[PDB]
């Protein structure tokens, strides 16, 4: 969500998500890497073959 | 929930395998600080999978050669001095089985390492080439177990009209495909054999049945033999060594 | 579109002629007729040195990969001949990762081709690219065989049954591979490759 | 267990302005390395690491507990003598000895900047590797891209450089710690 | 229903496989006078079947030895002259992977003949024996890729408190089972490796973590290492030869 | 056909930051030509091309 | 792009009066320039001729 | 859509379209030029005779 | 689907015109690597 993150213009929000914590010891735990993942957003274009890829 | 005395009164009923072989008397303890993963994603072009039964069935070269007009054609008949002496009819090539393959192919020689015994069913492929103007006729045929019987009984059977009634296949050069297939069923007294000694039986042979001819003298044409196993059945586990016969003691 | 990479890849081109001879004392079986490293820009069978610079004559795809540093592809050959139907022989074609010399029928992927059954337009055949990672590197120093990570391997063509021919026909024939690069893909632009006009920097 | 432990009871907002529960955040922060005098400047590549001496980047310090790295890395550069300069990538094969050729002649990604207006150069170096992972200070890939920078006219200059992990970057495989010094040097 | 001219106008669209490999340009003709059968009935005791993936997973011996009181215990700390010189902490045994297995076992060395590349995931088994009266404590641990990085980075990590934070497992002799299991995930830059050259990575080590003690001086106790592959993935077909690295040209 | 080919199996996002499937994108990128000293400067027209020497623009190479 | 024709053969000379760029400082003093060109968003190529011979590696020897 | 592309202000989006791929060989194909075409947007004005053409 | 022998047993029933005149005994083979188009748009004043 870098496009929105830059368009909105504020430093703080940096695209929210909520991770799935596990292995809690004393109220603290370790997030899964699987859910920390964030969208890349050019890949959809390359797979869908948007015109901009070809420069037109 | 009980202190483990150093070797006094262990459980006595435990049994579990480790490898595909080897049973074991007691369980290893799966304690360790971390459990890690495979790391790499594949990221590769696909390739066809490899299997053992599949690997054993692969085609193998067996022989290759020239064939030409000057070579002798098999006799219609026999005379005495050659009838008494167990004469054999002349041939371009002869091939033992299955040794030409198993002890003949280092690849197959390696795939069969440390297995005790096995069964096999052969296929053979003759492929001859020459010009349209050439004339000729070959025969590819299966002499049976032969060596396990009397010298006399593998002698009075070698003549043309008998040769043509054995299992086999002819090859005229008139054919455009110019290739033939021939199937050899397993056949022996013993139900299995270890690959790595002299388990020699059924001798395949190739024989001229009509002399090669062309407009000029001394024409020649090429040929190749190929073969592969099928219906294989491996059986048992053993050190890879030559075995011994009954009178001998090991 | 005529500037798409797939459009460039899809055109076949002849690479080079190869004689097979040839009536009387035909070359003995196991005699190689061809060794073709799998890369569009190999210096061996493409191009020559001229003024220290190693120029490389070739098809447009070769330029397209000449510019990028990393690449990946599969091969699609089309074998083709100059023969009568009075010539008659057979051929082996192997695909060898990190190898050399002919390697039997068993050890590696192989593919016998009868000549007499090759009607014209020739015979298509495709090979997979086995390699330790996903991306090949392009440029190499080597003046003969491919270096190492520069190419997936080699394809090797050799006689199985030696050629025979009638007195009415010429002794030898000529094989002419045609080819195209399936699933080509390129990465990281930037290279020393450039057109052969001149041979110098201005000052 | 036989614990005397009873869990805490304390507010978060009352005492310090922030809290952090990861080492990545510390690494995204950019820190100084070492001054680079002269013409033939050499910034570290994405393989990074293996500095001698004792002054060293924070990323460079976190580097020793791990084994694998992946992702792009960032640079800030502050030239001592103001004036425009250029930024380019290169590789060991890519270099030429014609003695009329110069670094622009390869057509790599380029970056111009006049420092009189914008003193702080900011450049991010991408991740072009064949492999999904990189053992730190790998030498298995000799031709990996490496940064170079030039003023035209090829005059001498010094630079204050400071590196940081890119947003794309991570470490993996936890090796145990290096010996490390802590206090100010004793005596002279 | 048409006379087959000797090689003029054969069908040009034919394609068919013979072996699991090798495509072929034209069909062999299945003509021959007779089709015979397998003959023998099995008449045998059954045995477990053999498979390739199964064969590769078989357990293998790796090392065996005595262990005794006089041998040194690993240091808590380092001093200068050994810190500058990339000192390595002493160990009873160390073992390379996967070479100890593949180039180490003639059986496995033969099963992998003519295959291009592969992946593996190891298991290891330590089995120590001694009397109830003995005291001691071992550690079995996995040094990582190590050799592919700087000499300095495999040097400042060798000391006790770091050794105990690597993946690994301890073995007290208080335990009655007296055996441990340790799993090693595949890990490298390259996604596959050919078995038959120096693809040396992750070096397993065994280290004393408490000196052996008994009522008398110079007590001793025995131990054995074993190991086996899992999650294997073979890939490609190639002649069985050592491969070469990038700067080298073949 | 007689193909051994089996189609690939690999992710796009795992290894490099981008992918491109056209030559136009390479040409929209701007590259250096040659230094133009003196008063009577001469930039190439839209007909472009036909430079000598060996240093040359990427557009000029395509 | 001011041309009468929909297409232009590269290095065409059929149109002598095509527009050409010029730049001047006032006072007409001497100066050098670092120039770098690029295809416009409007631009394209067409008709695929085969490749030129081209050099690849760094010059050998001195 | 250059007007929107400049008004939105973000570099990436560059006016989306989906091309009609053809001549697929192995999961890759060649876009038609007919569908890569993008709006020009002054032509509508010249044909419709908007006032701004005349400067008023 | 059959190898074309160099001039032995061609089809004997073929007939087709090329120009508005001239009948021809056998068909030309339409093989070639590419099929290209007309290029130019007209862009002209009409004439009768």
Place of tokens 């005291």: E135
Residues of chain F contacting residue E23, judged by C-beta atoms under 8 Å apart: 2, 4
Structural contact between residues E52 and E58, judged by C-beta atoms closer than 8 angstroms: no
Count of Cβ atoms closer than 10 Å to residue D105 Cβ: 18
How far, in Å, CA of D121 to CA of E151, rounded?
34
Q: Of how many residues is chain E composed?
A: 250
CA distance readout (Å), B248 to B244, B245, E98, E159, H14: 7, 6, 42, 62, 88
**β-bridge partners, C174:** C19, C82
Contacts of D167 (CB under 8 A, 6+ apart): D28
How far, in Å, CA of D76 to CA of D54, rounded?
21
For chain F, which chains pass the contact test of at least 3 CB pairs under 8 Å?
A, B, C, D, E, G, H
DSSP tally for chain A: helices H, then strands E: 3, 2
Tell me the three-class secondary structure of chain E, residue by residue. Answer: CCCCCCCCCCECCCCEECCCCCEECCCCECCCCCCCCCCCCCCCCCCCCCCHHHHHCCCEEEEEEEEECCCCCCCCCCCHHHHHCCCCCCCCEEEEECHHHHCCCHHHHHHCCCCCEEEEEEEEEEEEECCCCCEEEEEEEECCCHHHCCCHHHCCCCCHHHHCCCCEEEEECCCCCCEEEEEECCCCCCCCECCCCCCCEEEEEEEEEEEEECCCCCCEEEEEEEEEEEEEEEECCCCCCCCCCCCCCC
How far, in Å, CA of I6 to CA of G34, rounded?
64
Instruction: Calculate ∠ Cα E95-E97-E102, nearest 5°.
Output: 110
Structural contact between residues C2 and G48, judged by C-beta atoms closer than 8 angstroms: yes
Q: How many CA atoms lie within 13 A of C1 on its CB side?
A: 27
Place of tokens 């990465």: C187
Does residue H42 sit in helix, strand or coil? coil
Touch criterion met for D and I (3+ Cβ pairs within 8 Å): no
Instruction: Calculate ∠ Cα H32-H38-H39, nearest 5°.
Output: 145
How far, in Å, CA of D43 to CA of D149, rounded?
9
Q: Which two tokens stand for residue C144?
A: 């003969």
Count of Cβ atoms closer than 10 Å to residue C89 Cβ: 21
For chain E, which chains pass the contact test of at least 3 CB pairs under 8 Å?
B, C, D, F, I
How far, in Å, CA of I48 to CA of I43, rounded?
16
- List, in sequence order, the alpha helices (H) in chain F: 24-28, 58-61
Contacts of E1 (CB under 8 A, 6+ apart): none
Place of tokens 């190639």: E238
- Peptide linkage before B98 cis (omega within 30 of 0): yes
Say whether residue E5 is in contact with chain I using an 8 A CB cutoff: no
Structural contact between residues E49 and E120, judged by C-beta atoms closer than 8 angstroms: no
Contacts of A7 (CB under 8 A, 6+ apart): H8, H9, H10
Structural contact between residues D93 and D143, judged by C-beta atoms closer than 8 angstroms: yes
Q: Do B61 and C130 touch (CB under 8 A)?
A: no
Resolution (A): 3.3
Sequence ranges of the domains in chain H? 1-56
Count of Cβ atoms closer than 10 Å to residue B62 Cβ: 20
Q: Which two tokens stand for residue B236?
A: 């048992």
Helix, strand, coil percentages (3-state) for chain H, rounded to 5, are 40, 10, 55
How far, in Å, CA of F19 to CA of F9, rounded?
17
Best CA proximity match to D81, nearest among D158, D23, D150, D11: D158
**β-bridge partners, E185:** none
DSSP code, position B28: P
Q: How many CA atoms lie within 13 A of E186 on its CB side?
A: 20
Q: Does the CA dihedral E103-E108-E109-E112 come out positive or negative?
A: negative
How far, in Å, CA of B134 to CA of C167, rounded?
12
How far, in Å, CA of B1 to CA of I2, rounded?
82
Say whether residue D21 is in contact with chain A using an 8 A CB cutoff: yes
How far, in Å, CA of F26 to CA of F20, rounded?
9
Q: Do E23 and C145 touch (CB under 8 A)?
A: no
Tell me the three-class secondary structure of chain D, residue by residue. Answer: CCCCCCCCCCCCCCCCCCCCCCCHHHHHCCEECCCCCCCCCCCCCCCCCCCCCCCCCHHHHHHHHEEEEECCEEEEEEECCCCEEEEEEECCCCCCCCCCCCHHHCCCCEEEEECCCCCCEEEEECCCCCCCCEECCCCCCCCCCEEEEECCCCCCCCEEEEEEECCCCEEEEECCCCCCCCCCCCCC
How far, in Å, CA of B157 to CA of B141, rounded?
14
Size of interface C-D (CB pairs under 8 A): 36
Strand order in the sheet with D146-150: D110-114, D84-90, D146-150
Size of interface C-I (CB pairs under 8 A): 16
Structural contact between residues D127 and D168, judged by C-beta atoms closer than 8 angstroms: yes
Helix, strand, coil percentages (3-state) for chain I, rounded to 5, are 0, 10, 90
**β-bridge partners, D66:** D174
Say whether residue C187 is in contact with chain D using an 8 A CB cutoff: yes
Residues of chain F contacting residue H28, judged by C-beta atoms under 8 Å apart: 21
Q: Does the CA dihedral B159-B165-B169-B175 come out positive or negative?
A: positive
Structural contact between residues B41 and D133, judged by C-beta atoms closer than 8 angstroms: no
Our CA-based measurement puts residue C96 at a distance from the nearest CA of chain D, in whole angstroms, of 22
Does residue B110 sit in helix, strand or coil? helix
Centroid of chain to Cα C169: 29
Count of Cβ atoms closer than 10 Å to residue H15 Cβ: 14
Place of tokens 């998500």: A17
Say whether residue C135 is in contact with chain D using an 8 A CB cutoff: yes
Which of B39, B40, B43 to probe the F interface (max F CBs under 10 A)?
B43
Q: How many CA atoms lie within 13 A of D168 on its CB side?
A: 17
Q: How far apart are the first and last CA of chain C?
A: 40
Burial class (CB in 10 A: 0-12, 13-18, 19+), C88: buried
How far, in Å, CA of C98 to CA of C37, rounded?
11
Contacts of B72 (CB under 8 A, 6+ apart): B90, B208
Domain count of the fold of chain C:
1
DSSP code, position B83: H
DSSP code, position A52: G
Q: Which two tokens stand for residue A53?
A: 């890829």
Burial class (CB in 10 A: 0-12, 13-18, 19+), C16: exposed
Torsion angle of the four alpha carbons H9, H14, H16, H19, in this order, in degrees rounded to the nearest 10: 180
Touch criterion met for E and G (3+ Cβ pairs within 8 Å): no
Contacts of D138 (CB under 8 A, 6+ apart): D47, E148, E149, E189
Touch criterion met for F and D (3+ Cβ pairs within 8 Å): yes
Q: Which two tokens stand for residue E77?
A: 């700390």
DSSP code, position C163: P
Structural contact between residues B137 and B111, judged by C-beta atoms closer than 8 angstroms: no
- Chain breaks after residues in chain A, where C lies over 2.5 Å from next N: none
Tell me the three-class secondary structure of B143-179, residue by residue. Answer: CCCHHHCCCHHHCCCCCHHHHCCCCEEEEECCCCCCE
Burial class (CB in 10 A: 0-12, 13-18, 19+), C176: middle
**Long-range contacts of C98-101, Cβ-Cβ distance < 8 Å, separation of 24 or more:** C98/C153, C98/E194, C98/E238, C98/E241, C98/E243, C98/E244, C98/E250, C99/C153, C99/C154, C99/E238, C99/E239, C99/E241, C100/C145, C100/C154, C100/E250
Burial class (CB in 10 A: 0-12, 13-18, 19+), H17: middle
Structural contact between residues E118 and E202, judged by C-beta atoms closer than 8 angstroms: no
Structural contact between residues D72 and D164, judged by C-beta atoms closer than 8 angstroms: no
How far, in Å, CA of C153 to CA of C145, rounded?
10
What radius of gyration, in Å, describes the C-alpha atoms of chain I?
Answer: 19
CA distance readout (Å), F55 to D101, D103, D104: 8, 12, 10
Burial class (CB in 10 A: 0-12, 13-18, 19+), G59: buried
Count of Cβ atoms closer than 10 Å to residue A30 Cβ: 12
Best CA proximity match to D62, nearest among D28, D37, D106: D28
Residues of chain I contacting residue E10, judged by C-beta atoms under 8 Å apart: 3
Q: Are strands C53-56 and C48-51 parallel, antiparallel or unpaired?
A: antiparallel
Q: Do D136 and E165 touch (CB under 8 A)?
A: no
DSSP code, position H52: G
How far, in Å, CA of E211 to CA of E219, rounded?
11
Structural contact between residues E59 and B19, judged by C-beta atoms closer than 8 angstroms: yes
Structural contact between residues C154 and C35, judged by C-beta atoms closer than 8 angstroms: yes
């Amino acid at each position: 969500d870098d496009a929105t993150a830059s368009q909105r213009g504020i430093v703080t929000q940096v695209a929210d998500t909520v991770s799935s914590i596990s292995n809690v010891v004393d109220g603290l735990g370790v997030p899964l890497l699987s859910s920390i993942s964030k969208p890349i957003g050019w890949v959809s274009n390359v797979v869908s073959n948007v015109a901009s890829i070809f420069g037109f | 929930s009980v202190t483990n005395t150093g070797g006094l009164m262990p459980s006595a009923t435990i049994s579990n395998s480790e490898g595909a072989t080897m049973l074991l008397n007691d369980i290893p303890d799966p304690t360790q600080n971390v459990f890690l993963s495979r790391n790499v994603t594949d990221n590769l072009f696909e390739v066809q999978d490899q299997n053992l039964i599949e690997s054993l069935s692969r085609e193998v070269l067996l022989g290759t050669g020239t064939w030409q007009s000057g070579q002798a054609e098999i006799s219609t008949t026999l005379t005495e001095q050659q009838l008494i002496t167990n004469y054999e009819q002349p041939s371009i090539r002869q091939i033992s089985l299955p040794d030409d393959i198993v002890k003949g192919s280092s690849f197959i020689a390696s795939k069969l390492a440390n297995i005790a015994y096995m069964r096999c069913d052969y296929e053979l492929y003759l492929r001859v080439q020459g010009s349209p103007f050439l004339q000729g006729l070959l025969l590819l045929w299966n002499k049976m177990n032969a060596d396990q019987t009397s010298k006399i009984r593998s002698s009075i059977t070698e003549h043309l009209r008998s040769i043509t009634s054995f299992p086999g296949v002819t090859l005229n050069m008139q054919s455009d495909s110019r290739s033939v297939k021939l199937v050899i069923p397993y056949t022996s007294e013993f139900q299995v054999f270890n690959p790595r000694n002299e388990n020699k039986l059924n001798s395949v042979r190739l024989s001229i049945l009509s002399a090669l001819r062309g407009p000029s003298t001394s024409e020649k044409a090429t040929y190749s033999i190929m073969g592969r196993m099928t219906n294989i059945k491996l059986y048992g586990h053993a050190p890879s060594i030559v075995s011994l016969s009954y009178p001998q003691t090991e | 579109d005529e500037m798409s990479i797939q459009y460039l890849a899809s055109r076949p081109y002849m690479l080079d002629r190869y004689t097979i001879k040839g009536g009387n004392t035909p070359s003995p079986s196991g005699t190689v007729v061809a060794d073709i490293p799998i890369s569009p820009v190999n210096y061996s069978l493409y191009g020559s040195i001229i003024r220290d610079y190693r120029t490389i004559f070739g098809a447009p795809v070769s330029l397209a990969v000449a510019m990028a540093s990393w690449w990946r592809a599969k091969i699609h050959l089309n074998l083709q001949f100059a023969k009568t139907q009075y010539h008659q022989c057979r051929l082996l074609v192997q695909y060898l990762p990190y190898g050399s010399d002919v390697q039997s029928l068993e050890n590696v992927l192989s593919q016998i081709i009868d000549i007499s059954h090759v009607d014209e337009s020739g015979i298509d055949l495709c090979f997979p690219s086995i390699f330790t990672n996903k991306w090949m590197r392009s440029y190499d120093p080597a003046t003969e065989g491919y270096t190492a990570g520069c190419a997936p391997g080699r394809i090797l063509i050799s006689v199985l049954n030696p050629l025979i021919s009638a007195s009415t026909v010429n002794d030898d024939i000529v094989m002419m591979p045609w080819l195209t690069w399936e699933n080509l893909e390129l990465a990281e632009p930037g290279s020393l490759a450039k057109a052969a006009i001149g041979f110098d920097y201005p000052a | 267990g036989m614990d005397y432990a009873k869990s805490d009871s304390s507010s978060l907002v009352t005492t310090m302005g922030e809290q952090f529960r990861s080492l990545r955040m510390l690494t995204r922060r950019s820190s100084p390395t070492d001054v680079l005098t002269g013409t033939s400047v050499t910034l570290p590549g994405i393989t990074i690491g293996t500095d001698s001496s004792l002054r060293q980047s924070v990323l460079n310090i976190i580097s020793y507990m791990y084994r694998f790295t992946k992702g792009s890395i960032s640079y800030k550069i502050i030239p001592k003598i103001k004036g425009d300069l250029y930024i380019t990538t290169s590789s060991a094969d890519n270099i030429e000895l014609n003695s009329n050729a110069y670094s622009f002649d390869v057509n790599r990604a380029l970056h111009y900047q006049n420092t009189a207006l914008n003193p702080v150069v900011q450049v991010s170096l991408p991740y072009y590797c064949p492999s999904e992972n990189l053992v730190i200070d790998s030498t298995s890939f000799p031709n990996l891209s490496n940064l170079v920078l030039t003023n035209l006219e090829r005059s001498s200059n010094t630079y204050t450089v400071l590196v940081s992990a890119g947003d794309d970057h991570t470490f993996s495989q936890l090796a145990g710690c290096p010996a490390f010094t802590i206090g100010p040097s004793r005596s002279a």
